């Protein structure tokens, strides 16, 4: 019938009627074609069909299924927060809003863990692992469809006589359900926010370090090689070759960056390991001379090791440092998405309903609105995610501009 003064000022203020439709318009122009093309690439241009592509396809799908409703969302705010399209259509927008909110987090957790898991403990069932990833996506989609039930089924529109407007979502029509609303958004903020954030952050912890460990093995290989050429005694040559061998065997076990989604049984992957077999064999040739007593002769074999390193190794292990940089930028991209889109929203969602439950009004109402607005930016940050993960997306991204 009549809301609190603080809410009524916000619902008539420029923050909702000017700032919001502008930001939302930007998101519409930016996010719709970007995710539109990304979804197209993952379906009709990606011939790898790896579990990472599948997660990113649903991520783009979650983005699209929300941004398409933005023209009605923009029009709503421009006309002073007044909904004239019906209660059912309001609950649609509300549904797909919270759906993309939570699908994004869950699909980010899947993608981040999956990509980190292919580095720590890689497997070789690209076809089976894909089918699994599809099933997981269906499971996620249905679990969210079920969890967003108390948002679809409840009256989300109210006519405010003093404001002469019909608000959608922004005003709770039944102030008696605040108790239920509080617990609900507190459950999600823990189980669908913090818990996936914990799994997301630690995934990059293991991913980055391992990509710095591949850098360590390449570094140790180049460091010990320089020691042999400068060494004088037999003990300095014998130990440096044993250390260079251990680093070479560990680097062979790891997956190269040029051939990412290429299975460990593929002929391209065999070429990378072939260069290592010539390299390891040459360390064995040097050790044989070192064990017999020939120091200056061990030393001459290291010069042959530089020839194999510049022809086969500095072609595949050539761009492993570029792969490390992509993972970092990805970790930055994700962190910004959490810092801007996820954390301000979930935190305030609890805060907002907590105050309405305790006092009947919340002074964080303006922050709650700004938070919900900035949360939609995730679909604008999502294309940067596809750029650092998908190799096929980069081609279509670069060719377009």
């Amino acid at each position, epitope marked *: 019938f009549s809301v609190d003064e603080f809410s*009524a000022s916000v619902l008539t203020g420029k923050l909702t009627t000017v700032f919001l439709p502008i930001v939302y318009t930007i998101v519409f122009v930016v996010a719709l074609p970007s995710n539109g093309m990304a979804l197209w690439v993952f379906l009709f241009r990606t011939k790898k069909k790896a579990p990472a592509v599948i997660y990113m396809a649903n991520l783009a799908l979650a983005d699209l299924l929300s941004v398409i409703w933005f023209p009605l969302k923009i029009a709503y705010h421009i006309h002073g927060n007044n909904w004239i399209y019906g209660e059912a259509l309001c609950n649609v927008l509300i549904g797909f809003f919270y759906a993309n909110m939570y699908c994004s987090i869950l699909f980010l957790t899947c993608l981040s863990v999956q990509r980190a898991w292919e580095i720590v403990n890689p497997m070789g069932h690209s076809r089976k692992k894909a089918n699994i990833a599809i099933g997981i996506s269906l499971a996620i989609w249905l679990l969210i469809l079920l969890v967003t039930i108390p948002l679809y089924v409840v009256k989300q529109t109210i006519f405010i006589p003093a404001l002469q407007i019909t608000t959608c979502h922004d005003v709770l029509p039944e102030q008696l359900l605040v108790g239920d609303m509080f617990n609900y958004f507190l459950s999600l903020a823990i189980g669908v926010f913090l818990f996936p954030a914990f799994l997301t952050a630690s995934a990059y912890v293991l991913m980055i370090r391992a990509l710095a460990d591949l850098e360590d093995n390449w570094e140790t290989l180049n460091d010990n090689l320089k020691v042999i050429e400068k060494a004088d005694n037999a003990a300095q040559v014998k130990d440096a070759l044993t250390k260079m061998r251990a680093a070479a065997l560990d680097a062979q076990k790891a997956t190269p960056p040029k051939l990412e989604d290429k299975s460990p049984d593929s002929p391209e992957m065999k070429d990378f390991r072939h260069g290592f077999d010539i390299l390891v064999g040459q360390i064995d040739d040097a050790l044989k001379l070192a064990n017999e007593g020939k120091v200056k002769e061990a030393q001459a074999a290291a010069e042959q090791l530089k020839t194999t390193r510049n022809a086969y190794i500095q072609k595949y292990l050539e761009n492993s440092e570029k792969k490390r940089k992509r993972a970092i930028k990805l970790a930055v991209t994700v962190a910004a998405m959490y810092l801007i889109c996820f954390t301000p929203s979930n935190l305030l969602l609890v805060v907002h309903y907590f105050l309405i439950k305790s006092q009947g009004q919340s002074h964080v109402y303006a922050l709650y609105i700004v938070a919900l607005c900035l949360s939609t930016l995730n679909s604008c940050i999502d294309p940067f995610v596809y750029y650092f993960v998908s190799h096929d997306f980069r081609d279509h991204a670069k060719n377009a501009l």
Partner: antibody, heavy 119, light 109 residues
């Protein structure tokens, strides 16, 4: 900090018209909603009218509606409450109150004005 | 139109007692809509406990309101002489915004 004073009342002939002035100080009048609450001789409180801070947005209960007209003045910082066709049931202490929020209700009250509707 | 009944309408309590006074409603009201008011004879009824639990500015710690849904109550840990006043419960859930009966608190001698 915030203080309110009511002016008017007195002996009124039944079936007439009267104005009640509520003075405000210490806050921004337009930034807060205002309301009038009456108290019968049996010390029983009853809601009369509440006006929104944005503009002329009036609402009265069925028993009050059609007679009372709550007037607002932001530039003069004084709240009004005009009556028409007065009854002997209107004999009550009329209090002025500042409604901050719906969940906060009337945080600041006035002092009261004696109204004795009798011929 | 929710009817607010205050039980008891009049009660005597000696200083230092755990004073409790209830406010019953006809239909279900949110815990965010029931507010308490203290009224001393001659003076205006000033805000005491807003939205069943939260206390207003200058209100002593001895007051701690509890209750939600249909059952609502004002609780005083230590009874004092200045507490002797009429207490009213107010709702803003549905128009008309009805007030309570009034629990007249008096000193037991």
């Amino acid at each position: 900090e915030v203080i309110l004073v009511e002016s008017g009342g007195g002996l009124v002939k039944p079936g007439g018209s009267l104005k009640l002035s509520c003075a405000a100080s210490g806050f921004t009048f337009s930034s807060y909603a205002m309301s009038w609450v009456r108290q019968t001789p049996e010390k029983r409180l009853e809601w009369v009218a509440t006006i929104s801070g944005i503009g002329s947005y009036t609402y009265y209960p069925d028993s009050v509606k059609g007679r009372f007209t709550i007037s607002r003045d932001n530039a003069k910082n004084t709240l009004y409450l005009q009556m028409s066709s007065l009854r002997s049931e209107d004999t009550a202490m009329y209090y002025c109150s500042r409604q901050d929020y719906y969940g906060s209700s009337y945080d600041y009250w006035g002092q009261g004005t004696t109204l004795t509707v009798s011929s | 139109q929710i009817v607010l009944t205050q039980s008891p309408a009049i009660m005597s309590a000696s200083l230092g007692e755990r004073v409790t006074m209830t406010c019953t409603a006809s239909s279900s009201i949110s815990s965010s809509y029931l507010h308490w008011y203290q009224q001393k004879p001659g003076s205006s009824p000033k805000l005491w406990i807003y939205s069943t639990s939260n206390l207003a500015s200058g209100v002593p710690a001895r007051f701690s309101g509890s209750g939600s849904g249909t059952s609502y109550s004002l609780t005083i840990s230590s009874m004092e002489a200045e507490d002797a006043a009429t207490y009213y419960c107010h709702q803003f859930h549905r128009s008309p915004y009805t007030f309570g009966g009034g629990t007249k608190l008096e000193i037991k001698r």
